């Protein structure tokens, strides 16, 4: 009962806990020897595994799956790829915890599921919270720098652990914009295709106010524009 | 063009390590026409290739250097005399 | 920036020297300015 729960949550679906696209993972729930006690606990545990399957599947789907054949902002694009790259690194201590748990089960062969469910209670809040961010990005077709605000507006919550968790994904997504900005400002040529960072000689260089994030003011953006235009001109 | 396509993911240094050595005979090809004017090809892998005075022909590096190689080869071929 | 112009700098310096030597070989040997 203990060890294929690790097998199921790890992302290789079980023949007891049945993976569905409409019921997630689900216990067979028809045994002539099940009890009401175990039911609730298995239901509590299977939520995290369902979310984990969705997360890992999406990350594998939309990171490094092409040789570049414009794309879609919510299903392709370098900000979106960097979001997935931050997301799997945030998910790492869960994997470490499962690896620890197997050693615990090996050391003591008589162990029950409530012990496990007690240990995994800190992911029980973190995993449902982060789902809505990627859900909003995917559904609403958010393109370019407006991705950067979306996790940023969702790092205003009253839960410190979830806030600190999302901040790292945002920090990963800063660096790609930094990398392209280092070229456009200081030489005049940008290294980015299909994803914009508020760039529309002296022609086809103007500020896109709409894509520009809210936490970057307009006064600095004018200076950035003037710097890039100047170095491109001379 | 894959290089401009990806400069900010984890496959950036792997493709860079491939590309840095995938141009090694090309640099030799460039080092041929400038320094001796010598043509070199085996199966055909060179952008420039070999009439009225010269037997030189014209149709990676930028083209801003490709025509410069085309004219520096003819200058070498004259200076050989 | 990624560029192929971090290669041309020890090459074009030789190209320019070849061009200057050829133009000098015109004047001091073939006397084009007298012609």
Tell me which chains share at least 3 CB pairs under 8 Å with chain A. B, C
Residue B48, sorted as left (phi over 0), alpha (psi -120 to 50) or beta, turns out to be beta
Residue partners of B79: CB distance under 8 A and separation at least 6: C18, C21, C22, C25
Q: Do B34 and C15 touch (CB under 8 A)?
A: yes
Q: What are phi and psi of A86, to 5 degrees?
A: -70, -35
Q: Do A193 and B5 touch (CB under 8 A)?
A: yes
A171: helix, strand or coil: helix
Which residue among B4, B72, B78 sits closest to C15, beta carbon to beta carbon? B72
Give the count of Cβ contacts less than 8 A between chain A and C: 5
Which residue among B2, B8, B11 sits closest to A78, beta carbon to beta carbon? B8
Q: How many angstroms separate the CA atoms of A82 and A104, rounded?
A: 35
Residue partners of A200: CB distance under 8 A and separation at least 6: A206, A207, A208
Tokens coding A89: 């690194």
Tell how far CA A91 is from the center of its chain: 9
Residues of B in contact with C4 (CB under 8 A): 60-62
Residue listed under structure tokens 């605000």? A149
Q: Do C5 and B68 touch (CB under 8 A)?
A: no
Residues of C in contact with A191 (CB under 8 A): 1-2
Q: What are phi and psi of A199, to 5 degrees?
A: -110, 125
The answer to whether A79 and A147 are in contact (CB under 8 A) is: yes
Q: How many angstroms separate the CA atoms of A77 and A81, rounded?
A: 6
Q: Which of A163, A164, A199, A169 is nearest to A184 (CA)?
A: A199
Residue of B nearest to C17 (CA): B72
Q: How many angstroms separate the CA atoms of B71 and C20, rounded?
A: 13
Residue of A nearest to B4 (CA): A191
Q: What are phi and psi of A77, to 5 degrees?
A: 100, 150
Q: What are phi and psi of A18, to 5 degrees?
A: -90, 120
Q: How many angstroms separate the CA atoms of C10 and C15, rounded?
A: 9
Shortest CA gap A191–chain B (Å):
6
Residue of B nearest to C20 (CA): B75
The answer to whether B73 and B39 are in contact (CB under 8 A) is: no
Residues of A in contact with C1 (CB under 8 A): 183, 187, 189, 191
Which technique was the structure solved with, according to the deposited record? Answer: cryo-EM
Within B1-81, where are the H helices?
2-5, 12-22, 24-35, 63-79
Tokens coding A146: 């407006």
The answer to whether A26 and A18 are in contact (CB under 8 A) is: yes
The neighbouring-strand residues paired with A24 are: A20
Q: Do C18 and B3 touch (CB under 8 A)?
A: no
Sequential DSSP letters for chain C: ---STTTSHHHHHHHHHHHHHHHHHIIIII-TTT-
Tokens coding A143: 């393109």
Q: Which of A14, A185, B13 is nearest to A3 (CA)?
A: A14
Q: Do B78 and C7 touch (CB under 8 A)?
A: no
In this complex, is the C-beta atom of C1 within 8 Å of any C-beta atom belonging to chain A?
Answer: yes
**Mutate which: B5, B16, B62, vs A, most A CBs within 10 A:** B5
Total residues belonging to chain C: 35
């Amino acid at each position: 009962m203990i060890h294929e729960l690790l097998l199921a949550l790890s992302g290789y679906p079980g023949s007891i806990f049945t993976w569905n696209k409409r019921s997630g993972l689900q216990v067979s729930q028809d045994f002539p020897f099940l009890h009401p006690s175990e039911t609730s606990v298995l239901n509590r545990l299977c939520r995290l595994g369902t979310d984990y399957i969705r997360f890992t599947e999406f990350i594998e789907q939309y990171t490094g799956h092409v040789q570049q054949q414009q794309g879609q902002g919510g299903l392709h694009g370098i900000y979106l790829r960097a979001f997935c790259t931050g997301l799997d690194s945030v998910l790492q201590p869960y994997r470490q915890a499962l690896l620890d748990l197997e050693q615990e089960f090996l050391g003591d062969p008589h162990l029950s599921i409530s012990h496990v469910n007690y240990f995994l209670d800190q992911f029980q809040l973190l995993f449902p919270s982060v789902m809505v961010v990627v859900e909003q990005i995917k559904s609403q077709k958010i393109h370019g720098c407006q991705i950067l605000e979306t996790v940023y507006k969702h790092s205003c919550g009253g839960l410190p652990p979830v806030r600190s968790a999302l901040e790292k994904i945002l920090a990963v997504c800063h660096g790609v914009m930094y990398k392209q900005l280092s070229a456009w400002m200081l030489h005049g040529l940008l290294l980015d295709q299909h994803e914009e960072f508020f760039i529309k000689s002296l022609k086809q260089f103007s500020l896109r106010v709409e894509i520009l994030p809210s936490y970057i003011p307009v006064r600095v953006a004018e200076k950035i524009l003037f710097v890039g235009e100047s170095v491109q001109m001379f | 063009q894959e290089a401009l396509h990806n400069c900010s993911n984890e496959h950036y240094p792997v493709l860079l390590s491939l590309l840095k050595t995938s141009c090694e005979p090309y640099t030799r090809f460039i080092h041929d026409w400038v320094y001796s004017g010598v043509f070199r090809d085996a199966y055909g892998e060179f952008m420039i290739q070999v009439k009225l005075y010269w037997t030189h022909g014209y149709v990676v590096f930028l083209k801003h250097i490709a025509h410069d190689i085309y004219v520096c080869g003819k200058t070498i071929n004259l200076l050989k005399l | 920036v990624l560029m192929k112009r971090s290669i041309t700098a020890p090459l074009a310096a030789h190209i320019s020297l070849v061009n200057k030597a050829a133009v000098d070989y015109f004047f001091v040997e073939l006397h084009l300015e007298a012609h």
